[PDB]
Amino acid sequence: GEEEDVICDGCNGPVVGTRYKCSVCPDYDLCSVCEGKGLHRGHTKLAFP
Ligand SMILES: [Zn+2]
Ligand SMILES: [Zn+2]
């Protein structure tokens, strides 16, 4: 079956736990850690699991 895998754009690893998706860029996501490192600063992001 089709499964949409969420891969972190900061570490290239699959996002588990909390997903920080950019509201500006189409289809851009960070894991909780890369988000903690403050990557992709200038864009607003949605925070949800
Ligand atoms: Zn990451
Ligand atoms: Zn962005």
Side-chain angles (χ1 to χ4, degrees), residues 22 25 40 43:
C22 175
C25 300
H40 210 84
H43 281 180

Side-chain angles (χ1 to χ4, degrees), residues 8 10-11 31 34:
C8 174
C11 60
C31 72
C34 289

